[PDB]
């Protein structure tokens, strides 16, 4: 399980990024600009984005609903990263939010490595960057588990 010192390092180091609506929603359109960017295929998995390709995808309205609560489920599993039953079990909820959707368990997981360079980017020192690639490897498994 993560230990509370990373737990507080995650949460120090992407604190600027998560602290206040627009900041929240500003953090989300990058992961999604760079997934997308990666792989343009999967803008038509998303209901809200729905009429839009990757040439206007970032300029809808959808993709900030998006925006927000991917970050926002992100922040809520950093909260209790140091608590394995608890993230454990936010993690699959989180997960059974994929099972009934267009996206299959192999795309879930290709963006382990896009938001893992994506938010380290993000953080400011090598312990941080550390952090944020342990984060995301432990949680993406425990998500993808449910699809
Ligand atoms: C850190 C990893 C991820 C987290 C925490 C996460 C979280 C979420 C959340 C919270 C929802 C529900 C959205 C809502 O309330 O509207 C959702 C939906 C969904 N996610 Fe993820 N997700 C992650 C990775 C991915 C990846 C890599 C894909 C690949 C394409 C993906 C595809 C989807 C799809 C297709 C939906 C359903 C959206 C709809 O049809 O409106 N997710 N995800």
Redesign the pocket.
């Known amino acids: 399980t993560l230990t509370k010192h990373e737990q507080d390092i995650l949460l120090k180091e992407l604190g600027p990024h998560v602290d206040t609506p627009a900041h929240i929603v500003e953090t989300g359109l990058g992961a999604y600009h760079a997934?997308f960017t990666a792989?343009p295929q999967?803008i038509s998995?998303?209901?809200?984005?729905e009429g839009h390709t990757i040439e206007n995808v970032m300029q809808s309205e959808g993709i900030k609903?998006?925006a927000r609560?991917?970050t926002?489920?992100?922040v809520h599993?950093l909260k209790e990263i140091s608590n394995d039953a608890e993230v454990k079990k936010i993690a699959a909820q989180?997960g059974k939010?994929?099972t009934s959707?267009?996206?299959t368990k192999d795309?879930?997981?290709?963006?382990?490595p896009?938001?893992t360079k994506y938010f380290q980017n993000l953080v400011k020192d090598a312990e941080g960057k550390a952090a944020v690639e342990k984060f995301?490897k432990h949680?993406?498994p425990m998500?993808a588990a449910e699809i």
């Open positions: 997934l792989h999967y998995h998303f209901s809200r984005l609903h998006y609560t991917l926002e489920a992100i599993m989180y939010d994929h959707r267009k996206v795309e879930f997981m290709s963006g382990e896009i938001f995301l949680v993406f998500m």
